Amino acid sequence: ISEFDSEGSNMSTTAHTEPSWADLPFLDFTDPNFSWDSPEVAEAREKSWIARTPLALLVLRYAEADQLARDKRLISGFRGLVDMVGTPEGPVRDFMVDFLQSLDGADHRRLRGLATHPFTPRRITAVQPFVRSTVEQLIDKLPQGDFDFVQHFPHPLPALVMCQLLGFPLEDYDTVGRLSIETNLGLALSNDQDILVKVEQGLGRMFDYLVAAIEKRKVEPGDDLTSDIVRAFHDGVLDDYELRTLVATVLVAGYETTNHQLALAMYDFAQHPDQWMKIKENPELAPQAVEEVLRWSPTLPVTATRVAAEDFEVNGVRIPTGTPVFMCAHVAHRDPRVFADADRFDITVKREAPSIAFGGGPHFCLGTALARLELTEAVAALATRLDPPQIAGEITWRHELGVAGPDALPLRFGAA
Numbered sequence: 001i002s003e004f005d006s007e008g009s010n011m012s013t014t015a016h017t018e019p020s021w022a023d024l025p026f027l028d029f030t031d032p033n034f035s036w037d038s039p040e041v042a043e044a045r046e047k048s049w050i051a052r053t054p055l056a057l058l059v060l061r062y063a064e065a066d067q068l069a070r071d072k073r074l075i076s077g078f079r080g081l082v083d084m085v086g087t088p089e090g091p092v093r094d095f096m097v098d099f100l101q102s103l104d105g106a107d108h109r110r111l112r113g114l115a116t117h118p119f120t121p122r123r124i125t126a127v128q129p130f131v132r133s134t135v136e137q138l139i140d141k142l143p144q145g146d147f148d149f150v151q152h153f154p155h156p157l158p159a160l161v162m163c164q165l166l167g168f169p170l171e172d173y174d175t176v177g178r179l180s181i182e183t184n185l186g187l188a189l190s191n192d193q194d195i196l197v198k199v200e201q202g203l204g205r206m207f208d209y210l211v212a213a214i215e216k217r218k219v220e221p222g223d224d225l226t227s228d229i230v231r232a233f234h235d236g237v238l239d240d241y242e243l244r245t246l247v248a249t250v251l252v253a254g255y256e257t258t259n260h261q262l263a264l265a266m267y268d269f270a271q272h273p274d275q276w277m278k279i280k281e282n283p284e285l286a287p288q289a290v291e292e293v294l295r296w297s298p299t300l301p302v303t304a305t306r307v308a309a310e311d312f313e314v315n316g317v318r319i320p321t322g323t324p325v326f327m328c329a330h331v332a333h334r335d336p337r338v339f340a341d342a343d344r345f346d347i348t349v350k351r352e353a354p355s356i357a358f359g360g361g362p363h364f365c366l367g368t369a370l371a372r373l374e375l376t377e378a379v380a381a382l383a384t385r386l387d388p389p390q391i392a393g394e395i396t397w398r399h400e401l402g403v404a405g406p407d408a409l410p411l412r413f414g415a416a
């Protein structure tokens with residue numbers, strides 16, 4: 001998410017008025033040196049189900065993280081944040097107030113419903129051979145030495161899969177990846193006009209590409225998600241503005257997260273090569289391994305973000321209207337109430353509880369099932385075909401709040 005220039009302030013005034021906030025641990029997650037793995041983070045979770053931060057209440061335990069991701073009294077956060085920050089009237093404000101993640105209730109159900117079908121079990125099964133073949137072809141052409149796993153694998157896979165999903169030429173995967181990244185939604189709640197022009201231009205370039213695809217599909221429809229949403233448009237169900245906004249939401253949400261999560265898998269296995277070898281010996285372990293990567297290194301350590309729509313109380317805490325509530329999946333994933341030996345990466349444990357890397361409630365990740373398919377096909381093939389990864393240079397991390405994202409991940413597969 002974009003940091004908003006709360007800087008503590010609105011959370012501060014509320015904190016000064018709420019006795020039920022008096023015993024809540026404080027975590028300053030916006031500090032450049034903060035780590036989700038610091039001892040004080042675990043201590044905070046042991047102390048309390050919820051913490052205060054400068055921007056939001058932060059839910060630290062698994063049960064409550066799922067409860068509040070689903071609670072209808074917690075609506076999408078983006079529209080209130082835009083009002084607070086004072087985002088000028090324009091394309092950036094438009095997208096932040098109207099993209100699927102910002103919508104609630106009937107409009108949300110309507111628009112989301114137009115995009116759910118490619119992610120049903122039968123349509124995941126339908127795309128699995130493409131995913132498998134794409135992964136195989138990427139492994140085939142990997143460099144033999146030290147190389148950036150992002151450029152050579154974690155970028156192309158989800159870029160190609162998004163092109164295939166949305167009916168873009170596969171040869172546009174590089175362009176599509178760039179266009180997605182440069183939407184820079186992580187900066188969209190900035191107060192700086194120069195930063196917001198950069199977001200405005202990124203969004204504009206994306207829509208340059210998307211609206212051409214949409215206009216093609218209006219006359220030359222195919223068997224793809226763009227075309228399917230276009231049919232809903234021809235049927236009067238949504239308008240042109242909604243059409244492009246919905247396609248853009250899906251593209252942006254589906255690309256960088258998946259890219260990052262693939263890179264994080266490799267980083268985990270570089271630390272634990274013995275577990276890579278277990279997958280190689282028994283590649284049926286890949287789904288369980290993927291779930292352990294999602295548990296231990298979720299790419300969105302903050303998953304569900306919400307704001308209170310009314311004053312209410314949950315597990316002893318009064319949450320006043322307008323208070324942002326963020327679900328800390330990273331920390332919940334180490335909740336000893338749910339996970340055995342939670343502070344160890346171990347793909348060999350068959351766990352009753354899944355990761356909650358995809359949020360929850362009506363907004364839960366639209367692409368959950370496709371994300372897992374991509375991660376599983378990748379981990380199975382990489383572990384079958386290659387020696388364990390080891391890091392080969394500086395890993396460059398995205399600075400965005402709530403994101404664990406290697407921009408570049410130099411590695412080698414095997415010491416030789």
Ligand code: HEM
Binds near residue numbers: 069250
């Ligand atoms: C490992 C990869 C991914 C992770 C960890 C992830 C995680 C998330 C999370 C945490 C949310 C918020 C859920 C909530 O508010 O409760 C979300 C929303 C969303 N994601 Fe994903 N995502 C990933 C990949 C994808 C993919 C592959 C797609 C589509 C192809 C996608 C499309 C979306 C969309 C469209 C939303 C908004 C849903 C709505 O507001 O109704 N994401 N994702």
Ligand SMILES: [Cl-]
Binds near residue numbers: 045047335336
């Ligand atoms: Cl605990």
Ligand SMILES: [Cl-]
Binds near residue numbers: 046047049
């Ligand atoms: Cl307690």
Ligand SMILES: [Cl-]
Binds near residue numbers: 338339340350351353
């Ligand atoms: Cl467990």
